[PDB]
Every structure is written in C-alpha cells, then in structure tokens.
C-alpha cells in the first residue's frame, strides 16, 4: 500500500471511485500483486486473476453480480477516452495511456522499484 | 409552392429573417471533431469547390451554402483581404429568395455575414408560379 494512487488520480470521496482509479489503487498495493500486477513495462499491467479483480471491483461498487466479462466492457469504454488501452495479443494485459506520471508524481521505473516488481 | 406569395414582405417582417439581416457573427460548422489544421485545409479547399457549411453563432441557425448563380470566381473571393475569404450564395430559404453574404478568417474559421432579399430570383420565381 505505497503511494495513495486513488488520491493522486483525482478521487476525493465525492461520487463512486472510477474503475481505472480503483485498478490503479490495486496496482499500488503490494498485497494484490497476485491477481493484478505491472508487467514491468511503462504503465502496462496484467490481470492475472480477472475473476478476483472483478470480485473486489464488484465489492467496492456494491454490485455483487459483477464479473470480468462486465469489468472489461468498462475498460473498453476507456479506449476512446484515452485512459487505458489494450495490449493487443496479450491476454488480460492493458495499459494506462493517460499521464499517470504527472498524477502519481513517480515514473514507471520508480514505482516498479518501490513496489518491487519482478 | 416553391415560394411564398408575400415573398417581398415575408422578409421585411417575420423575426426570423430580420434577426439575420445585420453583420451577425457566423462560423464554419464542419468537422468540429477534428484538428483545427484539418478544418482549415478542408474549409478552404471546399470553398474552392464553391460549397461550405456555416451557421449564425448567435441564432445557431445552420446553413448549407452553394456559391453559384441561380468552379466559381466572384462568388468566392480571397483577394478582398489578406487572410479572409468573402463568399456569397443565393437560395430559397423558407419560400423567400435571398442571398447569403459574409467573410471568414482562413484561420479562426469564423467571421460575419447576413441575408438580403433577392428581388431578381424572387420576381423570376413569382413568375414560374404565377
């Protein structure tokens, strides 16, 4: 649970947390490295256990019937808004394309280090 | 009814035409979802083809313009100003023969313009209908 990714992204409490912000929050929590993690390339990440990520998302949003099939459509909505793109050819691998550096204040190498990514 | 009987008067009266009889601000309504450059090369080239899409920002009334008499030259001028483009195009708006005239910044893609009765077309038209 390193830097407060949720906050650095803009989240303040007002209104639900957005899917991309929640994911980012999971990527900055060393304990979640099992189901979600950085691929070690820029801001690209992989959902190793989509069903798990979906549950926690379902839980955090209070939509118990949630699931990856649905969570992904959420991500797909970002393609156009340039927040997160899909790593073509790599299963469950997406990438933040917004300016996470400016928000988090750290760079990919920096964060990967702090999070001890292997 | 290709045109309205009181063609002459319907332009003199009626708020519609009236509100659009002065140097009202106008703008190029095209490819708004595209880079400014593109809208520039597009808007101008398209003018060289004698056509353009413009609306009166104020009233928000859009209009498709065709710069020809009822490959152009005087209907679409780019000499009367170093950067602007003076245009002109007739039409039968709501049963009233009129002529749209105005200019636009070849950069800011906007300017001024307005409408003015077209005694000729109106008269000729009144004929075909009798």
């Amino acid at each position: 649970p390193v830097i407060p990714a949720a906050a650095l992204a803009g989240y303040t409490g007002s209104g639900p947390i957005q899917l991309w912000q929640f994911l980012l929050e999971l990527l900055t929590d060393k304990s979640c490295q099992s189901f979600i993690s950085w691929t070690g390339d820029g801001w690209e990440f992989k959902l190793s256990d989509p069903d798990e990520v979906a549950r926690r998302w379902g839980k955090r949003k209070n939509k118990p019937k949630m699931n990856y099939e649905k969570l992904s459509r959420g991500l797909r909505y970002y393609y156009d808004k340039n927040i997160i793109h899909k790593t073509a050819g790599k299963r469950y691998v997406y990438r933040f394309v917004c300016d996470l550096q400016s928000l988090l204040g750290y760079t990919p190498e920096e964060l990967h280090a702090m999070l001890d990514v292997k | 009814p290709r045109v309205v009987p009181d063609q002459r008067s319907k332009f003199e009266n009626e708020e519609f035409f009236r509100k659009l009889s002065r140097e009202c601000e106008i703008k190029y309504t095209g490819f708004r979802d595209r880079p400014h450059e593109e809208r520039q090369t597009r808007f101008q080239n398209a003018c060289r083809d004698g056509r353009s899409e413009i609306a009166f920002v104020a009233t928000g009334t859009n209009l498709s313009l065709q710069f020809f008499p009822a490959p152009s030259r005087e209907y679409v001028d780019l000499e009367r100003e170093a950067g602007k483009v003076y245009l002109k195009a007739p039409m039968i708006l709501n049963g009233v023969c009129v002529i749209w005239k105005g200019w636009i910044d070849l950069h800011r893609l906007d300017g001024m313009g307005c409408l003015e009765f077209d005694e000729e077309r109106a008269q000729q038209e009144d004929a075909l209908a009798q």
Binding site: - | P1, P90, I92
Partner: protein, 118 residues
Amino acid sequence: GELVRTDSPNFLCSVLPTHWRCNKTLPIAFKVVAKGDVPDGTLVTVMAGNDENYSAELRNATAAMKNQVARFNDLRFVGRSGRGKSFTLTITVFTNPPQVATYHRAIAITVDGPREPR
C-alpha cells in the same frame, strides 16, 4: 405516415419526439416530403443548432429524394440542445439553386433523454 409543415411552403417532414436521448436511434424514421416537384436523386441534408450549440453533431444526416420523399436512414442527434432549449432543424434540398427549409424547436436532445422520475 403523419407529416408536418416546416418553415418552408414547399416541404414537409415526419414527426420527431420532443425530447430524446443523444446518439439514440429515432422512434420514427425521419423523412422529408416535397410538395412541389423535385427531381429524384436530389440530395437532402439536415443540420441543427440553437443559442447554446451553434451546430449539433449529427449522424447520417443525408438522404436522396425519391418520389418527392427523402427517407433518412437512421438519423441521430449527438449534440445536446441544452436544458430546456431545443434545436432548430435546417433541412436543405440541393436543387438549382438549393432550397433550405427550417423548423424551429423541433427536438430536444439530452444525454439521458426521457427518464422516469427517480
């Protein structure tokens, strides 16, 4: 079906909902009827705007005249008309010279459109 006079003495059109959702397919295909004689194949085109949006984003706003009828295949409004405010249609029939017919307060477009009181 049922037509309606426009601000031009030479053209009529189908009826459009008073309030509708944006980018939402219409309930009744919009068509433009020409009282006078208009050569088949003639292009017809609609635009919209108001004192809040000078030019509404549209979709499939073009149709060709056929038997005095220009049937617009899936016309859609994407630009919003504003709270309370509506759009002023500008139907254009390309003849020599072109004939333009307006239609004030024709349709109100919003993000949700018609919604049941929450």
